[model samples]
Target: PKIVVVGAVAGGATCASQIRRLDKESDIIIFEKDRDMSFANCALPYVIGEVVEDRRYALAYTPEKFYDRKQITVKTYHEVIAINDERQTVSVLNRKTNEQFEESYDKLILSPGASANSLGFESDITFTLRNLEDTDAIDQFIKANQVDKVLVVGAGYVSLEVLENLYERGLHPTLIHRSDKINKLMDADMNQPILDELDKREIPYRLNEEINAINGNEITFKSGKVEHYDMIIEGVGTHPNSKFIESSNIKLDRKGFIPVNDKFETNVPNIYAIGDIATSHYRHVDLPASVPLAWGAHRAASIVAEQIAGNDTIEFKGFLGNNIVKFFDYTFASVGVKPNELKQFDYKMVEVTQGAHANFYPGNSPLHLRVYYDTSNRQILRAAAVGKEGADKRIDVLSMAMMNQLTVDELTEFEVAFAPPYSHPKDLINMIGYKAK
Candidate 1:
């Protein structure tokens, strides 16, 4: 069977490779609209920060490398213009050659990620990042100009990480956002300690403000205050790259995200969608959610390819929203649900403060936890954590408990490796069970 895959990043690229591994005789052609294929976009921020110096670390596969290893044809610079479900053919345009053609396929997979949102206007000084090209542009601009003052205009992970990167470069960086908190997924109180951390570092930030204009290096905010800066970073959000699929009969959400079933199949039987282009099952909530995460994309690809290869595979159960972000002096993590997002359950909340590790340990800091449980069942519902240490570790424990539907009561008996250098016998996790009713 001829398998035509669209957009070669996490989902598309992995699906094609997995398809070949499962069925060696299947002919595969991957259509990527850009110059690069399967590059590590998640690490692009670190590449810009020079925390990761080499570019090779960010590359998953080149066209030559992919072909030599998997014998798959990757057509970079070729964009799929339209899809015909009935005819089983897709129209393509060679961006470099300016040639238009149609490719017939028995199976089709789309993973055309998302495009970053802009500030509703364009300026040479303002930039938003999504891929390697965006990182290249930011790096080039910073070097070409004597950039001393940098303003990052968003409070999301991208904005915060980029701010950290610029700070490492010894530039005066400020964070500005229109919202009341860093991210909608995180509550404000959870963000307060982070704000305090920023304050301690002497990094200035402007909150609850909007940008009216960007003229050269000068920015005018909603308050009519104009400030001059060397450069600006905008990471407000993203729109799913589903315009190319708009012409197709595939069902897309109001926001243009595709809706797929457990096997990653869309409304069209032979066509599949994954990555940021589609939605996933939020197991904890039992809802279909658009969770644009690496694990979801890669797992969707794995399952879709296995099913397409006629191999026996279990359907995707769901995705738990697991994420962590690094700050100047702290790390923040979250899993399951946030209290603000939960209206369906009668949930109980508990806040606990304990030493990150054993008090006798040489290095110790406070660990803060906000956990929610269903009042009726006592099952863990959601959690958020932040501190100078141990936030990631505790968050993972909570993630496993929630994934397995364990009760908050069972957490007290959960045995943990304890030592003065590591953790207390009570374990901060155990403290939650003891304290919570």
Candidate 2:
């Protein structure tokens, strides 16, 4: 079988590789418009800050390594311009050679991820980081020019991460967003510490404001205010890269996100869509813009591969919306549904601050934990945490519990490893459970 996968970053790469693993004799080909296929998308911000010494470390797999080891044909700089579902063919454009061709496939997988949303402002100094080339351009610009002040025009994860990274490079960055929140992953009340952290760092930010226009080094705000910034980093949000399939028979939502079933199969047969451009099931909500995490891509690919291989052993339950981020001295993590997302269901949330470890322990720090549960049934719906330590661990544990349909009461008696250096006898997880009860 000739399996053709488009957009070879996370979802496409995983699907192709898993298909190869299941059926070694099948021919697998991957089309990636970007030069780098399987690089670490999450590490792009760290690379900008030079926290990651080399950019090469950001690459998870090179085309040479992929082909030599997995026998997968990876065509870099090749864009799939159109898909013909009835004919099982796609039109491809060779970006480097300016050549166009058509490829037939027994099965097709679309993983064209999301692209950064542009405010339609035209300027040579404006930039948006989404791919390796985008990062390279930003990094090169910083190295070649003497930039002091940066204007980050968004409060999303990418914007906040880039803002901190620019600060790490000793550049001043002012975060501006129409919304009055820093991180969308957490609730407004839960984000106070984050704002406090920014205040301590002396980072300037303007809430309820947006960029109206960019005039060279001057940026005009919607509130009739102008500020001079050496460069502008736009991280407002992202839209699905589904333009290539607009004319195709593949069905896309109003927002251009492809909808798929539990098997990752689209409305069209023999065709699957995954990643940022695809929407998976999230709890009871068919979120059009679901949490587009890397792990979700990997899981979707594995399920699709197994289904294609005739195994059908796995089923995608739903998205947990797990996420983690590092900001200065704190780490923030969240899993499952958020407090704001509980409007459709009967839910209650508990917020508690407890020790990350035993007080007697030398490196103890405060851990803020929030757990949401069903009001009637008392089932764990979601969890979020922020702290200098043990935040990731608590979230991971809660994520597992939510996945397994564990209740807050059960978490109170949950057996977790305890050590003074790591966690107290009654850990934060236990504390949260007790508080919720």
Candidate 3:
């Protein structure tokens, strides 16, 4: 069988390798429009901040590695212009030579990924951290120019990461968002600690402020405030890159995201879409949800690859809404549903908070864990935790529980490793479960 995977990032690369492992004889080709393949987009900001001093570390699997070991043909700088379902052929454009060609395949995997959310601003100073190229430009601008002040225009995880990296570089940044609070992924109670941290760090922020326009170093806000900054980083969000198949028979949701089944297969047979370009059906919500996360893309590809290999044992299940954020001397994590997401889904949430480590342990810093649940079914809806350390792993535990559909009662029985220096007999998850029960 001939398999062609588009966009060689997380989902497409995972599918390409999984297919090779299953059928070594299968002819496989992975196409990436970018010069580099399988680079970690998440690490771009850290690279800019010098946290990851070596930029090459962000490059996960290069095309040469794939060609040498996996015997997979990698066509970098090749863009797929169109997909012909009836003919099983894709029209490609070579970015280097401006040449066009067609490639036919038995199976096609589309993981084109999501594009940056552009606000249609007219200024060249506005920037976005969408990929390695964007980060490169941002890094170059910061070092080569007189960029002393920066205005960040979002409150999502990406924005926070950029903000923290800027702070790490000793650049105090200002954040302006439309919402009154930061980190909508956490409840009002859970965000208090973060608010305190922000205050302590002296990070300037303004909520309920909308950018009306930007002209030459000045930004006019809807709130009648004019702020001056050398540059702006727009971390607003992203829209799915489904334009290649927009007019096809595949069904895209109102938000321009393709709807995929459990196997990551679209309504159009023999065509599969994964990653940020498609939406998955959440088992709990029973509705199409766009989970724009790296893990979601990888899991979706894995499930589809298993089915393609005749195993058919893998299931997408759904997203647990898990996220982690790192600040100076602190990290925050959460799983399941967020407080603000409750009203969007018409479900009530019950939340409980607790300390992460044993209270009796000496030098045990403060750890905050907040869990949200379905008020009707008593199922764990979502959770968030923050502290100096161990927050990411602890939230991961809750994420797994949410993925397995474990109820509050069931989660309380989970056995987590414990010690005085690490954790308590009743870890944060169990303690939160006990409190919620």
Going through the candidates in the order shown, the clash numbers are 0, 0, 4
Candidate 3 lDDT, tens digit per residue, 337-414?
A: 556556654343333334556667666677776666666677766667777867887788877777777777676788
List, residue by residue over 109-210, the lDDT tens digit for candidate 2: 999998998888879888999888888899888877788899988887778888889999899998888988778887666677667778999998888999
Number of the top candidate by TM-score? 1
TM-score of 3: 0.92
Estimate every model's Cα lDDT from 0 to 1: 0.85, 0.85, 0.78
Scanning candidate 2 in windows of ten residues, the lowest lDDT window is 280-289
TM-scores of the models, in the order given:
0.96, 0.96, 0.92
Which 10-residue window in model 1 sums to the lowest lDDT?
179-188
- Once fitted onto the true fold, the runs of candidate 3 whose alpha carbons sit more than 4 angstroms away are 338-354
- Clashes, model 1: 0
Model 2 lDDT on a 0 to 1 scale: 0.85
Q: Which stretches in model 2 have alpha-carbon errors above 4 Å?
A: 283-289
